[PDB]
Design a protein around this ligand. Sequence first.
Ligand code: HFR
Ligand code: HFR
Ligand code: CA
Ligand code: CA
Lengths: 464, 453
Amino acid sequence: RAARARESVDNLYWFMLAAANSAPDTPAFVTRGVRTLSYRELRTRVDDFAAALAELGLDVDDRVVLEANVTPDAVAMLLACSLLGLPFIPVSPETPSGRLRSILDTAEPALFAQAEDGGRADVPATVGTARFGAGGLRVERAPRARVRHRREIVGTDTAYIIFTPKGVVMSHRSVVSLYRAILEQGLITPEDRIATTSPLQFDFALFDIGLALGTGAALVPVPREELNWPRRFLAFLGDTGATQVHGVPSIWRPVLRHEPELLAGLDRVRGILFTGEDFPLPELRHLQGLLPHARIVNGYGATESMACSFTEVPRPIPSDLERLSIGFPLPGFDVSLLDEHGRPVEEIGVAGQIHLRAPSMFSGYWDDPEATARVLVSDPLDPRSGRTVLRSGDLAYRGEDGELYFAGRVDAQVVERRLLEFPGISAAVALLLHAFVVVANIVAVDDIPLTVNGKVDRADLATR
Amino acid sequence: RAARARESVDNLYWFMLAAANSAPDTPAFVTRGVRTLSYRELRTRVDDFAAALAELGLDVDDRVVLEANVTPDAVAMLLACSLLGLPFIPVSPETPSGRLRSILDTAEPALFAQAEDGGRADVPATVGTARFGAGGLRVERAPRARVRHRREIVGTDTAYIIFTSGTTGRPKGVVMSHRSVVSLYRAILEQGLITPEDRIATTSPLQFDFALFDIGLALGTGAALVPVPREELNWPRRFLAFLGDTGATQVHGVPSIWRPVLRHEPELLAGLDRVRGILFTGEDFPLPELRHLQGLLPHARIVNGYGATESMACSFTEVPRPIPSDLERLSIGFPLPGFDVSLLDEHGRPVEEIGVAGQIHLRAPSMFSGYWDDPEATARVLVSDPLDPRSGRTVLRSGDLAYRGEDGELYFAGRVDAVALLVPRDPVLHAFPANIIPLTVNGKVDRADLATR
Ligand SMILES: Nc1ncnc2c1ncn2[C@@H]1O[C@H](COS(=O)(=O)NC(=O)C[C@H](N)c2cccc(Br)c2)[C@@H](O)[C@H]1O
Ligand SMILES: Nc1ncnc2c1ncn2[C@@H]1O[C@H](COS(=O)(=O)NC(=O)C[C@H](N)c2cccc(Br)c2)[C@@H](O)[C@H]1O
Ligand SMILES: [Ca+2]
Ligand SMILES: [Ca+2]
């Protein structure tokens, strides 16, 4: 009686668990005492969680809030939700009760699921509650009864919604389409062990989980506690055998400050990937210098396409490089640089708004058709087809070879990188005009404050 | 300097020519003296046409009107247009000059291409003109010079635009992405309807996506396409001789292709012991005519194909063998795996009651991008899913009514907005019931033509 996505249909369950068919006994997870979990045991876990979820009688398109960080149990849950066409809303357990309530009021999910050891209480009675562990999914309060209307699950069904409220809706066809494009460009192999640092509510964790499991590689989730302490973090990457380290630039700040020598001892790290914001070039030159046998990739993209471009940094980085390239869109992705009037910008070095044609496009903003119509727009180069493109809110310019350079947001123009030129300045935040700098008004500080997702907390700086 | 779609990107060129890599010397076409064309020779033809097209400096999304029927040359052209991200507008050569001008005014194509022997003259000077043959693509009048802005071709780029007249007299251009078409080709290749050993008799004009279905299904599989010329079709003897001499194993056509053959040559039709399959779509197959065709070819599986241009297709259901004599109407069955139908009432609420008619709302991976230059029409048809109105997920509001049986099978129950005609003012009920068949170019009942009596 529960709809299950068929093998022939774009769905996270089939995409991420292909390796259970082809290599059941290869490790899918490495966690902490270093233990592996097989693709086979991972799949059995997804299936058990799916059986328990199926019994609740949720229709396809019914929403499950998933409060957890990147764990084998949290990934088995989102894959079980995926199989049953139940869109997952990932929420980090470090989210204030206030912001979870706001998500629960807009999303109106049928079910809220957290870990057995998780400590969320005071979820309202309108929403069902459950708890997951390797033992199984245990229901505290059953969702209200309903009639199931959807017969079959399809590729355009919603896989996940990312809330910041702003809810980016993403189809299984869209996510899998990005996973395929980056598997094509050959960024990692089944032999790799991917250190992922992002919280689960940030699609960079969904990228890392999908990239890894889709390839047949092992995921190495780094808990936030291990991450906070430079020596704890490096010992974690060491003990788990990480070959690839994925994170926002900020994961490196403490280790470059307090433990440069020890970071130079990650003899097994073949790669580093970052996205989310500019990597300060001084910090980036230092990390490259200490790990010379590690490929470093600049990943550019937004939640509404999951991602867009992946560009290897020059090795070494030119010491008077003004800006890093965000390179070329993935095969099957295409960027126009349009001026204020939607006209192409064919002049090298002139900034225009990135308009993205992608096979990984979001379905829309949850319950916000007016916002959707401002962002997901008629292709200005083919306005009559009804083709839509992402109006990105990102400015960029091209070099002589057609490479892109991120030039900040349209909405932020009303200094950072000309302070990075000054000796001893390793990271600089300017906002509206104060400036805050890591060594009108200018305040030197120790570290920059971070959002939960690990970006420059500009709002927090604004208030001091 | 021209953009070419990459191998990894949903595109008709790579989808339809994969067999040139894996089986270059298997036949892709059988035509009439019975001659084959290999996947290898087909590809060489597409590649030559692509080199010639590339020289015209067309940008990705620039439109090429293709006036032709299903020929090896016409298919090589649409695959070369495909590779270069140039959307093809297929037009039947028996289209009045008046209707071609209407398409040319809306579509504002950069190029109009026809066969060497084709006889369209005085195409306007605003549009480039060319002619194709085995010899090559020859440009009479070159398209305007322009600046190429598109760097890369993507799966969501427009493969083809199908132009008919809407329910008003306004041009109706169904825009279809490469990702959308290839997605349907894959779903029907999955269901295993034909094999590389099959020879597909295709009857549709090129301007009807049933020809695009047949071309794609066949070439995508590695099978052989058997295009039936329109003249040979109209004369029943010539038609059956053609199916016989070409070794056709599958016959694709609207029901009307059978009317003449069942009238004048039933016993000759019974001679095609090589036909394993028949496929039809476009309208109801009259049961008497269908029982007659079944009777004459008892070793032929017959499939009921249901769908519209805006998803290319939807469902494929075997007609029962034999047809139980007490059948009210044929089942249009179950949507293809990865396709899904809701039956909604007038208020967008689900219809869970067996035998009650609702409007088909279709969730499909083969959805059209929109109606050419008609965003208001697009918003009436490509609508917010009434079962998930907040996601921004969209469904096809089909304009078809249907109902379900005991087992959840579908039955077509006609149009929401609606041979027995209802000519309006109470609508008077004529038939050809108060008082008591001409064909559209695509081979359907010309209801409009009967209405004028
Ligand atoms: N590489 C850069 N240099 C500079 N500015 C960047 C870069 N990457 C982004 N950004 C900025 O961050 C915005 C986007 O924010 S987001 O929607 O929260 N998503 C993200 O941050 C992460 C994004 N989904 C993602 C996830 C996985 C892999 C990749 Br590859 C990308 C972009 O619009 C840019 O303004
Ligand atoms: N099998 C039926 N029983 C009864 N009524 C049918 C059937 N198939 C359609 N129709 C009608 O024709 C309409 C649609 O018209 S259309 O856009 O010109 N497309 C078509 O005719 C053909 C359609 N693209 C197609 C092409 C190839 C294969 C298949 Br499988 C389907 C549908 O809305 C239906 O009303
Ligand atoms: Ca254009
Ligand atoms: Ca629903």
